[PDB]
Motif scaffolding. Structure first.
Motif, PDB file in Angstrom:
ATOM      1  N   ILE A  11      35.640  51.372  39.216  1.00 49.51           N
ATOM      2  CA  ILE A  11      34.438  51.558  39.998  1.00 49.51           C
ATOM      3  C   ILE A  11      34.277  53.085  40.151  1.00 49.51           C
ATOM      4  N   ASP A  12      33.227  53.645  39.567  1.00 51.17           N
ATOM      5  CA  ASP A  12      33.120  55.110  39.533  1.00 51.17           C
ATOM      6  C   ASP A  12      34.438  55.656  38.992  1.00 51.17           C
ATOM      7  N   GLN A  13      35.062  56.624  39.642  1.00 56.99           N
ATOM      8  CA  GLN A  13      36.258  57.252  39.108  1.00 56.99           C
ATOM      9  C   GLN A  13      37.570  56.545  39.492  1.00 56.99           C
ATOM     10  N   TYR A  14      37.514  55.334  40.062  1.00 56.33           N
ATOM     11  CA  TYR A  14      38.669  54.578  40.508  1.00 56.33           C
ATOM     12  C   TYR A  14      38.836  53.371  39.595  1.00 56.33           C
ATOM     13  N   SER A  15      40.062  52.855  39.568  1.00 60.81           N
ATOM     14  CA  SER A  15      40.383  51.734  38.702  1.00 60.81           C
ATOM     15  C   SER A  15      41.637  51.025  39.205  1.00 60.81           C
ATOM     16  N   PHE A  16      41.711  49.729  38.916  1.00 59.78           N
ATOM     17  CA  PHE A  16      42.814  48.933  39.416  1.00 59.78           C
ATOM     18  C   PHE A  16      42.949  47.750  38.508  1.00 59.78           C
ATOM     19  N   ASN A  17      44.167  47.260  38.392  1.00 60.87           N
ATOM     20  CA  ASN A  17      44.531  46.201  37.464  1.00 60.87           C
ATOM     21  C   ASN A  17      44.453  44.842  38.167  1.00 60.87           C
ATOM     22  N   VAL A  18      43.819  43.873  37.503  1.00 68.08           N
ATOM     23  CA  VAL A  18      43.669  42.513  38.004  1.00 68.08           C
ATOM     24  C   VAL A  18      44.334  41.569  37.001  1.00 68.08           C
ATOM     25  N   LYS A  19      45.290  40.785  37.467  1.00 68.31           N
ATOM     26  CA  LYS A  19      46.049  39.931  36.570  1.00 68.31           C
ATOM     27  C   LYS A  19      45.287  38.636  36.322  1.00 68.31           C
ATOM     28  N   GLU A  20      45.595  37.977  35.214  1.00 68.21           N
ATOM     29  CA  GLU A  20      44.870  36.780  34.806  1.00 68.21           C
ATOM     30  C   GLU A  20      44.866  35.716  35.900  1.00 68.21           C
ATOM     31  N   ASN A  21      43.673  35.321  36.336  1.00 65.32           N
ATOM     32  CA  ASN A  21      43.494  34.342  37.418  1.00 65.32           C
ATOM     33  C   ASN A  21      44.087  34.806  38.766  1.00 65.32           C
ATOM     34  N   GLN A  22      44.177  36.109  38.988  1.00 60.34           N
ATOM     35  CA  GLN A  22      44.524  36.606  40.308  1.00 60.34           C
ATOM     36  C   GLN A  22      43.364  36.370  41.278  1.00 60.34           C
ATOM     37  N   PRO A  23      43.664  36.110  42.564  1.00 61.83           N
ATOM     38  CA  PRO A  23      42.580  35.816  43.532  1.00 61.83           C
ATOM     39  C   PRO A  23      41.806  37.047  43.995  1.00 61.83           C
ATOM     40  N   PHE A  24      40.908  37.490  43.132  1.00 62.18           N
ATOM     41  CA  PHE A  24      40.153  38.709  43.335  1.00 62.18           C
ATOM     42  C   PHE A  24      38.680  38.374  43.396  1.00 62.18           C
ATOM     43  N   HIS A  25      37.987  38.856  44.427  1.00 63.79           N
ATOM     44  CA  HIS A  25      36.596  38.480  44.613  1.00 63.79           C
ATOM     45  C   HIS A  25      35.679  39.653  44.881  1.00 63.79           C
ATOM     46  N   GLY A  26      36.116  40.864  44.559  1.00 63.84           N
ATOM     47  CA  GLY A  26      35.148  41.914  44.372  1.00 63.84           C
ATOM     48  C   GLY A  26      35.502  43.190  45.079  1.00 63.84           C
ATOM     49  N   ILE A  27      34.473  44.000  45.213  1.00 61.29           N
ATOM     50  CA  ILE A  27      34.625  45.353  45.732  1.00 61.29           C
ATOM     51  C   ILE A  27      33.697  45.558  46.917  1.00 61.29           C
ATOM     52  N   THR A  53      28.324  45.694  48.766  1.00 66.69           N
ATOM     53  CA  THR A  53      29.397  44.891  48.221  1.00 66.69           C
ATOM     54  C   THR A  53      28.980  44.323  46.881  1.00 66.69           C
ATOM     55  N   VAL A  54      29.877  44.366  45.910  1.00 65.92           N
ATOM     56  CA  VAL A  54      29.647  43.681  44.632  1.00 65.92           C
ATOM     57  C   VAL A  54      30.708  42.583  44.576  1.00 65.92           C
ATOM     58  N   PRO A  55      30.379  41.343  44.889  1.00 66.98           N
ATOM     59  CA  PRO A  55      31.378  40.264  44.834  1.00 66.98           C
ATOM     60  C   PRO A  55      31.627  39.802  43.408  1.00 66.98           C
ATOM     61  N   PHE A  56      32.802  39.231  43.169  1.00 68.02           N
ATOM     62  CA  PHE A  56      33.111  38.581  41.897  1.00 68.02           C
ATOM     63  C   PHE A  56      33.313  37.083  42.077  1.00 68.02           C
ATOM     64  N   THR A  57      32.661  36.277  41.238  1.00 64.02           N
ATOM     65  CA  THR A  57      32.917  34.835  41.252  1.00 64.02           C
ATOM     66  C   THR A  57      34.403  34.533  41.134  1.00 64.02           C
ATOM     67  N   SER A  58      35.078  35.205  40.213  1.00 59.97           N
ATOM     68  CA  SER A  58      36.482  34.988  39.911  1.00 59.97           C
ATOM     69  C   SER A  58      36.900  36.023  38.877  1.00 59.97           C
ATOM     70  N   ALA A  59      38.206  36.044  38.580  1.00 61.53           N
ATOM     71  CA  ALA A  59      38.772  36.945  37.572  1.00 61.53           C
ATOM     72  C   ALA A  59      39.655  36.158  36.618  1.00 61.53           C
ATOM     73  N   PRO A  60      39.062  35.482  35.640  1.00 60.24           N
ATOM     74  CA  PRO A  60      39.859  34.577  34.803  1.00 60.24           C
ATOM     75  C   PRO A  60      40.702  35.267  33.750  1.00 60.24           C
ATOM     76  N   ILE A  61      40.355  36.475  33.302  1.00 55.28           N
ATOM     77  CA  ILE A  61      41.167  37.171  32.308  1.00 55.28           C
ATOM     78  C   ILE A  61      41.652  38.484  32.881  1.00 55.28           C
ATOM     79  N   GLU A  62      42.901  38.822  32.587  1.00 54.17           N
ATOM     80  CA  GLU A  62      43.505  40.090  32.962  1.00 54.17           C
ATOM     81  C   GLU A  62      42.687  41.270  32.441  1.00 54.17           C
ATOM     82  N   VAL A  63      42.367  42.177  33.356  1.00 53.56           N
ATOM     83  CA  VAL A  63      41.409  43.240  33.066  1.00 53.56           C
ATOM     84  C   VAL A  63      41.693  44.399  34.002  1.00 53.56           C
TER      85      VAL A  63
END
Ligand SMILES: COC(=O)CN(C)C(=O)/C=C/c1ccsc1
Ligand SMILES: COC(=O)CN(C)C(=O)/C=C/c1ccsc1
Lengths: 237, 300
Positions: B17-33, B3-13
């Motif tokens: 991860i390898d050949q996969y990708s997904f959109n995270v909106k600014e300050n969305q409640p996202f904490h990792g993979i 697991t690679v946790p994320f503290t938070s996702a403050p900016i939209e990005v």
């Protein structure tokens, strides 16, 4: 970069440079075999390496034996040219080594660059000019020494004879190129022009006749007429 | 599964991860993979919604430590970091999984794409290319230049790829100028494979690592390096049969995975036409040639 009309005067400045022309290195006659197929027979050739400032010409004779048992001769000819030019540079004292080598055909750039990796400060350049150096085998004394050779041999020629006593290198090179262009466009007419008058001779240690200044102007005019002519005869204009 | 946790996702990005990708909106409640396969290297990479300039990311191997991401608002990017307190890390991850705030590395079970793209890419070998010895993971971005690029300007931030140069004293044996330039077997087999690389697996890994930095970050010097290592083999008349067979497989999956819309900048027309159609190995890359001709016939 490349050499063209815009930087033409760099040829006559005081940085040592050589033109290298490989057109006449690999020469063949094509003929029919008894079975009615086609074969080539190589004849002797030459590398034409020339200092445009001094007239100094290093004529390396390419003896037919260097082709024996080799394949892809047109490609080998370019590498053999590069090897011989590189050997020549290495044989020269450092203060006589060129700062640039200008190849008359672009297929020589890679062969020469690879052979000169030991000389990173010598620039290898192509040119956009259509220089007539292939016609140097129309110069009787140069043709004679190539055809008579029985082994590899270097012969030193001054392609300007004594002209620099009276004219500048720029003018000498322009005369040489006009003469070579004429010999290339119509050899017989050009040779007729040069030798019609038996009273003008070629000194034993020269390539071209001992024309006076006034006679060279007439000669030069006649070569220009010849070249413009053959261009009409050729294009019907 | 790691697991690679994320503290938070403050900016939209956009997160890869390898050949996969997904959109995270600014300050969305996202904490990792979560569920990242062990046994492979991985890259986790970023492109900010605001500034599509500078794709950047982190090469890592979950066997080498516990890693997380944390946005740094001073340097303005998502940073990889290592947690040395093992119990603190397990505690963090388990809480985030319980609250289901993590995306699952979405590997299809038939799929060997990532293994095929990374068969010879090690993490310790990757560290030789990216010098920053105090971290177990490696940062790469779009603009980093290679050692050979700086020769033609900061050395700490460079990609140290193997210097390959067909018109060099290393490539050309004195007295074999024509032979060695037209048949690079000496330079492949003695100089590179026996002198710098030891075996044919290390050679492939640098080549694979070069491709992935080109594809994921648009790193131009990596693209040059990939094509150079391909050309060096294709232009050698004498290549072990096993290396050719493996090469065809390696390239096959690289071509398969390349985004269709990026082929115009990631593929060198001259190198590919030469390799497939003119080089000694023009008849030795059957799978690669078949996929190239069916997918990118324009380039050829
Ligand atoms: C004046 O007519 C000459 O023939 C005199 N030449 C031959 C020279 O002074 C030297 C030429 C040369 C040197 C290296 S390669 C050619
Ligand atoms: C300084 O040069 C190197 O370290 C290159 N060599 C010789 C390798 O074996 C590296 C292979 C490799 C790189 C990424 S994955 C595998």
């Amino acid at each position: 970069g490349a050499m063209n009309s815009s930087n033409y005067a760099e040829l006559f400045n005081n940085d040592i440079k050589l033109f290298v022309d490989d057109t006449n290195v690999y020469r063949v006659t094509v003929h029919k075999t008894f079975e009615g197929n086609v074969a080539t027979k190589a004849i002797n050739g030459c590398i034409f390496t020339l200092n445009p400032k001094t007239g100094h010409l290093f004529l390396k004779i390419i003896h037919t034996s260097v082709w024996a048992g080799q394949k892809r001769l047109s490609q080998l000819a370019k590498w053999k040219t590069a090897e011989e030019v590189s050997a020549l540079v290495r044989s020269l004292p450092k203060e006589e080594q060129p700062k640039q080598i200008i190849v008359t055909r672009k297929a020589m750039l890679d062969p020469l660059e690879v052979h000169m990796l030991d000389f990173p400060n010598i620039a290898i350049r192509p040119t956009e000019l259509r220089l007539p150096f292939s016609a140097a085998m129309s110069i009787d004394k140069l043709s004679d020494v190539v055809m008579k050779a029985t082994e590899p041999q270097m012969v030193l020629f001054n392609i300007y004879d004594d002209w620099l006593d009276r004219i500048s290198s720029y003018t000498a090179f322009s005369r040489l190129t006009l003469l070579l262009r004429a010999l290339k466009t119509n050899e017989e007419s050009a040779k007729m022009i040069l030798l019609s008058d038996p009273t003008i001779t070629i000194k034993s240690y020269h390539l071209w006749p001992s024309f006076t200044d006034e006679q060279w102007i007439t000669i030069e005019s006649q070569m220009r007429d010849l070249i413009l002519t053959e261009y009409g005869r050729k294009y019907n204009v | 599964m790691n697991t690679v946790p994320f503290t938070s996702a403050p900016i939209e990005v956009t997160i890869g991860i390898d050949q996969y990708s997904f959109n995270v909106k600014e300050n969305q409640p996202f904490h990792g993979i979560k569920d990242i396969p062990i046994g492979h290297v991985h890259v986790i990479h970023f492109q900010h919604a605001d500034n599509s300039s500078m794709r950047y990311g982190y090469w890592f191997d979950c066997r080498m430590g516990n890693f997380y991401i944390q946005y740094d608002p001073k340097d303005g990017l998502y940073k990889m970091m290592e947690e040395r307190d093992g119990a603190k890390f397990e505690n963090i991850v388990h809480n985030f999984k319980e609250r289901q705030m993590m995306v699952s590395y979405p590997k299809i079970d038939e799929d060997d794409t990532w293994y095929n793209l990374t068969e010879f890419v090690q993490m310790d070998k990757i560290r030789k290319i990216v010098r920053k010895d105090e971290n177990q993971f490696s940062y790469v971005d779009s603009s980093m230049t290679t050692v050979q690029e700086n020769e033609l300007s900061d050395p700490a931030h460079s990609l140290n790829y193997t210097v390959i140069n067909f018109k060099s004293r290393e490539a050309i044996r004195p007295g074999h100028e024509m032979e060695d330039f037209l048949d690079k077997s000496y330079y492949l087999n003695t100089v590179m494979l026996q002198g710098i690389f030891k075996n044919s697996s290390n050679y492939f890994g640098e080549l694979q690592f070069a491709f992935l930095n080109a594809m994921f970050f648009g790193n131009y010097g990596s693209s040059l390096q990939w094509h150079a290592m391909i050309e060096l083999i294709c232009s050698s008349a004498t290549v072990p049969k096993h290396m050719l067979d493996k090469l065809d497989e390696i390239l096959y999956y690289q071509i398969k995975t390349l985004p269709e819309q990026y082929s115009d900048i990631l593929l060198n027309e001259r190198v590919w036409n030469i390799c497939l159609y003119s080089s000694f190995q023009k008849n030795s890359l059957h799978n690669t040639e078949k996929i190239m001709e069916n997918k990118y016939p324009e380039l050829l």
